[PDB]
Amino acid sequence: RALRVLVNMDGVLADFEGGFLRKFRARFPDQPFIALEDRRGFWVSEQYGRLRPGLSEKAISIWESKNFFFELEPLPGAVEAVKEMASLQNTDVFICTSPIKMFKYCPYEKYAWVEKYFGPDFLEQIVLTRDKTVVSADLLIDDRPDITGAEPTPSWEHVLFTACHNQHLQLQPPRRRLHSWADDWKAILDSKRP
Amino acid sequence: RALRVLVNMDGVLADFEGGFLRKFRARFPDQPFIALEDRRGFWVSEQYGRLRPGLSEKAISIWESKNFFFELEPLPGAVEAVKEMASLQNTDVFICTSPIKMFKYCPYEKYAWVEKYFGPDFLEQIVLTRDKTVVSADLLIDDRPDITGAEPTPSWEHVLFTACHNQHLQLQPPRRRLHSWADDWKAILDSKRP
Ligand SMILES: O=c1ccn([C@@H]2O[C@H](CO)[C@@H](O)[C@H]2OP(=O)(O)O)c(=O)[nH]1
Ligand SMILES: O=c1ccn([C@@H]2O[C@H](CO)[C@@H](O)[C@H]2OP(=O)(O)O)c(=O)[nH]1
Ligand SMILES: [Mg+2]
Ligand SMILES: [Mg+2]
Ligand SMILES: [Mg+2]
Ligand SMILES: [Mg+2]
């Protein structure tokens, strides 16, 4: 009866792409980098790998570092929108995020970040999973174009959240975007209600 | 098409009740304790709270401590059964566990424990959530009797895994138990297949 919305963390709430570029440039000032307008394809490390040998591993070392996830800046409007969304009648919001392979810091820091921006009570809304298709909901707002896993027919409609890496992608017509948090997310939610 | 089984961590894979009692008795040797045969009700801290003032907070301090989750012993047969289960044709296994409120160690250590007992590739199967009803599957094997949340009609059948705290409970007849990992878990899975 309550509409259930899964909101992705990196690329939707937290500015992974911007945080990564800043920290990559500071740590590796003599390496070439990819400006955000030139990002293509979901995986940062894949595009850096194509740019030169060794750069995939150096990119990965940025997000494996302590405080990388914790120090990510919220995307404009994201905290405000999710706070409002969760406060809506008949609306349950979960934050659905996948941890990286190296798990020393990342899970912890994601909990710490949600506490910092949404408060202790919002920690109850976090779902950490590598497979988003096994989480059931009406909507999934997520910047990754292709979201697959063990469930061939997910219950959610995936709404693509615009990010530098996907902004040029033509989607298969049924598929829909949320262009930013300034865009009309309430209309998207309402289209799914009874 | 693949049968999806959610296997709970504490009380099913990891011996939380035994680990807790041992560490509580070592840290607080002059306090009364609850032998496992006398445990009743899911929440350890609630029963300790009834035993005397201040004991809820002392119990909580055990599982909030560094290395509590990591050092939990697997329950008999649990690692072997889950390894076999995941290897079965047309069978996907996820480990579904809720973190405690204090998140400094617990998420991290749960990933570390799964790596230790199941290997790096099994980390892909972990689902960390406070609300298990929003995870879709055919089965949930979990020692907690009452599992509720945002989804009023979960897709899974909850099979109650026997634990000291629930072993005397009469269930509402449709409901089923897995009595231990030595019990016939394959028959339970097969009853759900096409
Ligand atoms: O190039 C990358 C690499 C990683 N990630 C975030 O980390 C999760 C695990 O790879 C990815 O699933 C994603 O986290 P999420 O969007 O689920 O919070 C990126 O965002 N971009
Ligand atoms: O008395 C207690 C207190 C906590 N827990 C485990 O920690 C999660 C959060 O409370 C509880 O959900 C449970 O973890 P899970 O079974 O999901 O791995 C217990 O097991 N017993
Ligand atoms: Mg993302
Ligand atoms: Mg609400
Ligand atoms: Mg349990
Ligand atoms: Mg299998």
Side-chain angles (χ1 to χ4, degrees), chain A residues 3-6 137-141 156-157 159 188-189 192:
Chain A
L3 189 76
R4 189 180 313 133
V5 182
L6 308 178
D138 297 284
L139 286 164
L140 170 60
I141 297 170
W156 34 255
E157 177 186 351
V159 172
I188 296 176
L189 270 60
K192 310 302 294 192

Side-chain angles (χ1 to χ4, degrees), chain B residues 12-174:
Chain B
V12 173
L13 301 182
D15 187 9
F16 182 101
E17 292 272 351
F20 165 76
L21 176 61
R22 174 163 75 65
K23 284 174 162 176
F24 179 88
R25 294 191 72 185
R27 199 175 142 190
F28 296 119
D30 298 344
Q31 295 297 324
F33 60 91
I34 304 186
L36 298 188
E37 78 175 358
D38 300 326
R39 283 281 293 105
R40 304 280 187 284
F42 178 74
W43 299 111
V44 168
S45 71
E46 293 188 344
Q47 197 176 4
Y48 278 72
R50 239 127 41 196
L51 186 64
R52 22 131 62 81
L55 233 46
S56 172
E57 293 77 5
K58 287 182 170 69
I60 286 158
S61 79
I62 301 304
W63 56 76
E64 289 190 355
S65 295
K66 193 179 208 283
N67 292 314
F68 178 76
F69 287 96
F70 182 68
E71 290 180 358
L72 295 181
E73 287 295 319
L75 286 150
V79 174
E80 300 94 340
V82 168
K83 282 180 177 175
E84 197 188 354
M85 182 191 298
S87 83
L88 299 178
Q89 295 291 292
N90 302 307
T91 305
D92 292 335
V93 177
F94 291 84
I95 294 175
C96 186
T97 178
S98 299
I100 55 167
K101 285 171 198 187
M102 208 287 281
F103 50 79
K104 190 64 188 116
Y105 314 114
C106 166
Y108 162 67
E109 287 183 21
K110 285 185 176 273
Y111 282 80
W113 194 95
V114 170
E115 183 192 58
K116 169 171 178 157
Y117 291 109
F118 295 98
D121 288 347
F122 224 77
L123 295 169
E124 298 291 342
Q125 306 305 310
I126 293 164
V127 180
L128 245 193
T129 180
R130 296 275 292 189
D131 187 340
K132 297 163 182 165
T133 69
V134 306
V135 191
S136 58
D138 297 284
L139 286 164
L140 170 60
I141 297 170
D142 194 306
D143 64 305
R144 183 160 183 187
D146 301 309
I147 299 179
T148 57
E151 176 51 62
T153 60
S155 57
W156 34 255
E157 177 186 351
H158 178 192
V159 172
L160 183 69
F161 192 89
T162 297
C164 59
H165 63 76
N166 72 33
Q167 66 176 328
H168 294 111
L169 275 177
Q170 180 169 191
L171 306 177
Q172 296 297 147

Side-chain angles (χ1 to χ4, degrees), chain A residues 47-108:
Chain A
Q47 197 176 4
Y48 278 72
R50 239 127 41 196
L51 186 64
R52 22 131 62 81
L55 233 46
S56 172
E57 293 77 5
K58 287 182 170 69
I60 286 158
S61 79
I62 301 304
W63 56 76
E64 289 190 355
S65 295
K66 193 179 208 283
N67 292 314
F68 178 76
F69 287 96
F70 182 68
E71 290 180 358
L72 295 181
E73 287 295 319
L75 286 150
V79 174
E80 300 94 340
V82 168
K83 282 180 177 175
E84 197 188 354
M85 182 191 298
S87 83
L88 299 178
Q89 295 291 292
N90 302 307
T91 305
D92 292 335
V93 177
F94 291 84
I95 294 175
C96 186
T97 178
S98 299
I100 55 167
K101 285 171 198 187
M102 208 287 281
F103 50 79
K104 190 64 188 116
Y105 314 114
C106 166
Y108 162 67

